């Protein structure tokens, strides 16, 4: 139903819109790393998230390093499974080239180009796909103008040769926080968005104002990862600040994916130790974070 109704997504005047030009807001879950917690990514669990939580997007977080794709490329087949499930479920799907410790996207750019060539050749004639080409650039020596923008200007052409206009999300500096610099030096492609990531354990008032600055430059922003925890993914759940961010995102029509769908013993994890990898979770099998995120998407 979602993808049949909204169909082809695009950017118009800095906003995500559907094929009839109406604003649309995606809300869903991210996997944790597919090399660690891939058992939670399958048609049945995605169907349960669609039907019980109300998700309309799912993000497949394919780490590159940390035992991910560069070390063992078999994880690309789990991305394919997730994309195919999203197609069958009629929801959107984010293919996330999940850089982190490999903090400059240029480190594995050759591999990225080949991966995105393959994915856009396979799936480029479906409207469900959203490409996220570099999760979280980070480090003082990785800047928008010097590293990230030129990386995007190598990878985007590869995708566009196969898929002329599905959305591409491009990471920003400082762990996808530095939307100000990206918004002042935007990419040419008209269906690009810039990633912004937050964690509710950080006091967020200036970060909200910086997102507003970026939006005021006509840049489109996708909150492709956020947590209810501290920036480590752990240390406590911060639902008051999370709610402030939820309301901000609704006011600004910002799409989002929450980190993350796993049973790992960390506060950002949505599931308890006993949660079935194929879905059907009871209240007791959701963590405090998961309970909150489910409520937010159901309310929407």
Curated annotation (Swiss-Prot):
It catalyses: Endohydrolysis of (1->4)-beta-D-glucosidic linkages in cellulose, lichenin and cereal beta-D-glucans. One of its GO terms (cellular component) is extracellular region. Substrate binds at residues 32, 36-37, 63, 98, 199, 231-232, 259, 264-266. It is found in: Secreted. GO terms for molecular function: carbohydrate binding; cellulase activity. The keyword Secreted applies. GO terms for biological process: cellulose catabolic process. It comes from the Bacteria. Its EC number is 3.2.1.4. It is an enzyme of class 3 (hydrolase). The active site is at 136 (proton donor), 225 (nucleophile). Keywords: Carbohydrate metabolism, Cellulose degradation, Glycosidase, Hydrolase, Polysaccharide degradation, Secreted, Signal. The keyword Metal-binding does not apply. Monomer. Belongs to the glycosyl hydrolase 5 (cellulase A) family. This is Endoglucanase 5A. It comes from Salipaludibacillus agaradhaerens (Bacillus agaradhaerens). The gene is cel5A. The chain holds residues 30 to 329 of 400 of the full protein.
């Amino acid at each position: 139903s979602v993808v049949e109704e909204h169909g082809q997504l695009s950017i118009s005047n800095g906003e995500l819109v559907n094929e009839r030009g109406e604003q649309v807001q995606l809300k869903g879950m991210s996997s944790h790393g597919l090399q660690w917690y891939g058992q939670f990514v399958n048609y049945e669990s995605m169907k349960w998230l669609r039907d019980d939580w109300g998700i309309n997007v799912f993000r497949a977080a394919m780490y590159t390093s940390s035992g991910g794709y560069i070390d063992d490329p078999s994880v690309k087949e789990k991305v394919k499974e997730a994309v195919e499930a999203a197609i069958d479920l009629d929801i959107y799907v984010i293919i996330d080239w999940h850089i982190l410790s490999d903090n400059d996207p240029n480190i594995y750019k050759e591999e990225a180009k080949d991966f995105f060539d393959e994915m856009s050749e396979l799936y480029g004639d479906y409207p469900n796909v959203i490409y996220e080409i570099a999760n979280e650039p980070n480090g003082s020596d990785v800047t928008w103008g010097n590293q990230i923008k030129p990386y995007a200007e190598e990878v985007i052409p590869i995708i566009r040769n196969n898929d002329p206009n599905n959305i591409i999300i491009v990471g920003t500096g400082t762990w996808s926080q530095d939307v100000h610099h990206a918004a002042d030096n935007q990419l040419a492609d008209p269906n690009v968005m810039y990633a912004f990531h937050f964690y509710a354990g950080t006091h967020g008032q200036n970060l909200r104002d910086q997102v507003d600055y970026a939006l005021d430059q006509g840049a489109a922003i996708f909150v492709s990862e956020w947590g209810t925890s501290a920036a480590t993914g752990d240390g406590g759940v911060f639902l008051d600040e999370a709610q402030v961010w939820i309301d901000f995102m609704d006011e600004r029509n910002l799409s989002w994916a929450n980190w993350s769908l796993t049973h790992k013993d960390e506060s950002s994890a949505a599931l308890m130790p006993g949660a079935n990898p194929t879905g059907g979770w009871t209240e007791a099998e959701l963590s405090p974070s998961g309970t909150f995120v489910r409520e937010k998407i159901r309310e929407s």
